[PDB]
Design brief:
structural genomics, unknown function, globular, Non-ribosomal Peptide Synthetase Peptidyl Carrier Protein, Chain A, conserved protein domain, Resuscitation-promoting factor Rpf1, 71% helix, mainly alpha
């Protein structure tokens, strides 16, 4: 889908740690032949968990399960959470 925005484009304006987690997933997915959006959703969900460990609110878990393969949907759904957790 090469004219589509990639997860890295979707988080162009996100906090640095979000950009880092998404960049790593997108790089690895390309190398290993895995699904980029799915890996990026997993990496960002994990980053949120790591930042909170430092309990996952049920809403964030729910938005993960509702958007497992849809990066833009996952990021948009959790954008307010991300803005708070990463301030």
């Amino acid at each position: 889908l090469n004219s589509a925005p990639t997860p890295r484009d979707v988080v162009a304006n996100a906090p640095a740690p979000v950009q880092a987690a998404v960049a790593g997933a997108q790089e690895y997915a390309a190398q290993a032949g895995l699904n980029t959006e799915e890996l990026a959703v997993d990496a960002l969900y994990n980053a949120i968990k790591v930042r909170l460990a430092g309990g996952i609110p049920p809403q964030i878990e729910a938005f993960y399960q509702a958007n497992r393969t849809n990066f833009n949907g996952f990021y948009m759904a959790n954008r307010g959470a991300i803005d708070f957790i990463f301030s």
